[PDB]
Design a protein around this ligand. Structure first.
Ligand SMILES: [Cl-]
Length: 725
C-alpha cells in the first residue's frame, strides 16, 4: 500500500482502478475542472482506502465534477465543491452504477452553491446507498434547484437496514425554493417507506434551512433522530411515511422567525421525547407540533392513521400552534388512536397554542403542565399552573421550581454550531444586507453611473447627484446595490432600452428618492422599468423601492413597472410610499408559473403608503397554481394605499386592480379604491389566510372571492369595508 500524489486527472485515472487496502490518494492543491472522481476498492477496517487533499480547503472541484464511492472501507475527505454542478444524479454518491459502498465514510466536504443552472432540473447533493456508511463533519449550504440536499436511498435490500450515521454536519442556508422539492434531508421514499432504514441522524446543526415545509422528510421505518439543533429553520421535522421512528433530544430555536416549525406526526409507533421547542411560529402542517389525521386503508403515498404515538417529556416554550387530529376532512377521517401525551411542559408567555380538529379521545393525556387554559375538556390530563422559568448556561429554559415534573430531562445538552462542519471553511451570512457597504457619490452622468455600478461591491450605496440620467443601455444588477438620491426629487432617470434594470443572480436592488420616466423608452409593447433575467434565474432576489416617482410609462401598451422572469423568485418585493402615474401595464407581474405545479414568483409582497393614478393594469398579478401544499407563500400585504383608475385596461384579462390566485397569506387593510377595478381573490388549496379590512370602495365593485378547491362560501375575512356607489 502506498501514497499517491496526484496532480492531474490522467494521473488519477492511471491508478483509480487498482486501489488496494491501505492506499491513500492525495489530490494536489488547486481547482480541478470536470473531475468525475470514482473512489473504489476493497479496503479493510485496519487498512481503508483513503482520498484526501494536499491541503484541506485548497482542493476545489468545479465545473461538472462529482464523487462516487463503490466497494468497502473507503474514506473520502477534505474536498470543496463550488462553481459547478454534478453532471449525474448526485454530487456525492455512495455508489458507482449498480455497485454500492459499504462501511465507508465521507467527511469534511464543503458543497457551496454547487447548483444546476436549471432550478427545475432535479438532483441530490449527497445520496446514501449501501449499509454502514457515515457522512460526518460536512458543510452544505446554498442548494437552489429542485431536489432534496441529502437523500438516504432504499431502492434495494442492500441499501435498506443500512444503519447509516449522519452526524456533526452543518446544514447551512437553503433559500425558500418557491416550490415542492426543497427538503434538506430525506430518508426513503413512499414506495420503499415500509422498509426499515435504521438511519441514525445525530448532532447536526440546521440553520435557516428554509427550502419548504419539510426540512427533514422521514419516509421509512425505525430511524433515530437525536440531538440535532434547528436554528431559525423554516419548516418542520415530518414523520411523513414509515413507522417506528424515534425523535428525541432535538432542539428547535425559532426565535419568533416566521414559519419556524417543529415536529409533525403521521403513521405508527413513533417515540417523541425529551425534545426542546422554543419560539416556533409556523401554523397548519408547518406548526410547532402536529399530530395528523389519517386516511382509512391509506394508499402508500397519502396519510396513514397515527397509532401508538408516544409523546413524552417535551418542552414547548412559546410554540404558537399545537394541532391534534389535524387535516381532518372527508378523506383524512382516521383520528389518532392508542397514543399518549405525558409529562409535557407547554408554556406560552402570551396565549395561542393548542387546537383539536377531530376526536382526540384516542390520545391519553397524563401529567401535562401548561400556564394557559390549554385543555379544559381533557381536564385531568393537563393542569394549568404558573411556571416561572430560568434559562440555563446551555441556553435552555427550565422551571425554577424543582416540584415541576414535566418537560424535557434536566441535563439536556445543546449542540454547538462550532462543533459541526469544518473549521477551515467559514459559516457566512445567507445574504448580503442592503446598505452594509460603502457609499459612492455619483456624478450627474449616465457614464459615471454605469462606471460606479460596475466598480461597486455587493452591499454598497450609490448616492446620485442632482440632474438627469438618460441611460442608453440596460443596467445589469448582479450584486446587492442601493440607489439613493442626494436629495429627494432632484434625480431624474430615463432609459432607451426595453428595460432600465435587469436583476441577475446575486443581484438585489434598493431604490430611494428617484424619479423614473419611460418617456425615452422604445415605442413598442413589453417595456418594463425593472425585470429579472427572463429565464434561468437561480438566486432569490430582493427589490425595495421607497419615496420614488414613476411616471409616463405609457408610450405603448403593456408597459409594466416590474416583470418577473420564468422561474424567478423574490424573497421580498417592498414598495413603500411611492407615486405611480400613467402606466399602461401592470405594476407587479408575478404570474409566469402557468404549469400549475405549485411554483410561484414571490414569497413576500408588501405595498404600503403608495399612490397609484391611472394604471391600466393591476397593482399585482400574483399566481400560484395547482394543488401543492409544500410551501409557505406567496404573502401579500396592501395597506394604506390610494388607487385612482387602476385596472380598467382593456388588456387586463383579470378585470382586477389586485389579483391573488393561490396566495397563502393576504392582508388588505385601510386602502382607498376609487374608480378602479375590484379585488379578485382565487383561493386554491392549503386553507389560505385572506383578510380584507377597513377599505373604502368608491365607484369600485366590492371584492370578489372564489373557492376553487372547496365547496360553498369563501373563507376570507371581510370586515368594516365601505362600498360607495
Ligand atoms: Cl428511496
Amino acid at each position: 500500500a502506498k501514497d499517491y500524489l496526484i496532480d492531474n486527472k490522467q494521473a488519477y485515472a492511471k491508478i483509480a482502478n487498482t486501489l488496494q487496502a491501505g492506499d491513500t490518494v492525495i489530490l494536489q492543491n488547486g481547482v480541478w475542472h470536470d473531475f468525475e472522481i470514482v473512489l473504489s476498492g476493497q479496503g479493510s477496517k485496519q487498512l481503508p482506502i483513503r482520498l484526501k487533499p494536499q491541503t484541506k480547503g485548497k482542493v476545489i472541484l468545479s465545473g461538472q465534477s462529482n464523487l462516487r464511492l463503490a466497494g468497502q472501507y473507503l474514506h473520502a475527505s477534505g474536498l470543496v465543491f463550488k462553481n459547478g454542478y454534478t453532471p449525474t444524479s448526485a454530487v456525492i454518491e455512495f455508489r458507482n452504477g449498480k455497485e454500492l459502498a459499504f462501511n465507508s465514510r465521507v467527511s469534511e466536504m464543503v458543497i457551496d452553491n454547487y447548483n444546476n443552472p436549471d432550478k427545475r432540473e432535479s438532483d441530490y447533493w449527497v445520496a446514501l446507498y449501501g449499509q454502514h456508511n457515515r457522512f460526518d463533519h460536512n458543510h452544505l449550504e446554498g442548494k437552489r434547484n429542485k431536489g432534496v440536499t441529502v437523500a438516504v436511498r432504499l431502492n434495494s435490500e442492500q441499501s435498506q437496514q443500512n444503519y447509516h450515521q449522519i452526524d456533526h454536519n452543518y446544514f447551512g442556508y437553503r433559500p425558500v425554493f418557491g416550490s415542492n422539492g426543497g427538503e434538506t434531508l430525506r430518508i426513503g421514499t413512499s414506495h420503499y417507506s415500509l422498509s426499515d432504514s435504521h438511519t441514525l441522524v445525530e448532532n447536526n446543526y440546521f440553520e435557516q434551512t428554509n427550502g419548504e415545509v419539510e426540512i427533514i422528510s422521514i419516509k421509512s421505518g425505525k430511524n433515530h433522530i437525536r440531538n440535532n439543533v434547528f436554528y431559525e429553520a423554516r419548516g418542520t421535522l415530518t414523520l411523513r411515511h414509515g413507522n417506528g421512528n424515534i425523535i428525541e433530544e432535538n432542539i428547535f430555536f425559532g426565535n419568533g422567525v416566521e414559519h419556524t416549525g417543529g415536529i409533525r406526526v403521521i403513521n405508527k409507533d413513533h417515540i417523541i421525547r425529551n425534545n426542546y421547542l422554543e419560539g416556533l411560529t409556523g401554523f397548519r402542517f408547518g406548526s410547532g407540533f402536529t399530530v395528523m389525521n389519517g386516511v382509512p386503508n391509506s394508499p402508500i403515498n397519502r396519510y396513514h392513521q397515527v397509532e401508538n404515538a408516544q409523546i413524552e417529556n417535551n418542552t414547548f416554550i412559546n410554540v404558537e400552534h399545537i394541532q391534534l387530529a389535524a387535516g381532518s376532512d372527508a378523506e383524512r377521517s382516521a383520528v389518532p388512536i392508542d397514543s399518549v401525551m405525558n409529562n409535557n411542559l407547554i408554556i406560552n408567555d402570551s396565549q395561542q397554542s393548542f387546537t383539536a380538529f377531530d376526536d382526540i379521545s384516542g390520545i391519553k393525556f397524563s401529567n401535562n403542565i401548561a400556564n394557559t387554559a390549554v385543555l379544559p375538556s381533557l381536564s385531568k390530563g393537563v393542569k394549568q399552573q404558573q411556571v416561572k422559568l430560568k434559562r440555563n448556561k446551555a441556553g435552555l429554559l427550565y422551571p425554577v421550581s424543582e416540584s415541576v415534573f414535566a418537560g424535557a430531562k434536566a441535563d439536556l445538552t445543546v449542540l454547538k454550531k462550532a462543533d459541526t462542519g469544518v473549521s477551515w471553511y467559514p459559516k457566512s451570512p445567507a445574504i448580503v444586507a442592503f446598505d452594509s457597504g460603502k457609499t459612492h457619490r455619483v456624478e450627474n452622468s449616465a457614464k459615471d453611473l454605469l462606471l460606479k455600478i460596475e466598480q461597486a461591491h455587493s452591499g454598497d450605496v450609490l448616492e446620485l447627484s442632482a440632474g438627469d440620467y438618460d441611460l442608453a443601455k440596460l443596467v445589469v444588477i448582479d450584486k446587492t446595490l442601493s440607489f439613493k438620491a442626494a436629495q429627494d426629487g432632484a434625480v431624474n432617470l430615463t432609459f432607451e432600452r426595453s428595460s432600465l434594470f435587469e436583476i441577475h443572480d446575486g443581484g438585489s436592488l434598493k431604490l430611494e428618492g428617484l424619479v423614473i420616466s419611460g418617456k425615452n423608452s422604445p415605442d413598442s409593447a413589453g417595456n418594463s422599468v425593472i425585470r429579472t433575467k427572463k429565464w434561468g434565474m437561480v438566486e432569490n432576489y430582493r427589490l425595495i423601492m421607497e419615496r420614488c416617482q414613476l411616471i409616463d410609462l405609457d408610450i405603448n401598451h403593456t408597459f409594466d413597472f416590474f416583470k418577473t422572469g420564468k422561474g424567478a423568485l423574490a424573497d421580498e418585493i417592498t414598495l413603500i410610499n411611492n407615486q405611480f402615474s400613467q402606466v399602461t401595464g401592470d405594476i407587479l407581474r408575478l404570474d409566469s408559473e402557468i404549469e400549475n405545479l405549485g411554483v410561484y414568483n414571490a414569497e413576500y409582497v408588501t405595498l404600503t403608503n403608495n399612490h397609484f393614478d391611472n394604471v391600466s393594469g393591476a397593482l399585482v398579478k400574483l399566481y400560484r397554481g395547482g394543488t401543492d401544499e409544500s410551501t409557505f407563500g406567496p404573502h401579500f400585504l396592501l395597506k394604506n394605499n390610494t388607487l385612482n383608475s387602476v385596472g380598467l385596461g382593456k388588456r387586463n384579462k383579470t378585470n382586477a386592480s389586485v389579483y391573488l390566485h393561490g396566495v397563502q397569506v393576504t392582508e388588505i387593510a385601510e386602502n382607498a379604491f376609487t374608480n378602479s377595478a375590484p379585488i379578485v381573490v382565487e383561493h386554491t388549496v392549503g386553507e389560505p389566510q385572506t383578510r380584507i379590512i377597513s377599505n373604502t370602495f368608491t365607484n369600485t365593485a366590492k371584492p370578489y372571492i372564489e373557492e376553487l378547491n372547496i365547496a360553498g362560501s369563501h373563507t376570507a375575512i371581510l370586515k368594516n369595508n365601505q362600498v360607495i356607489q
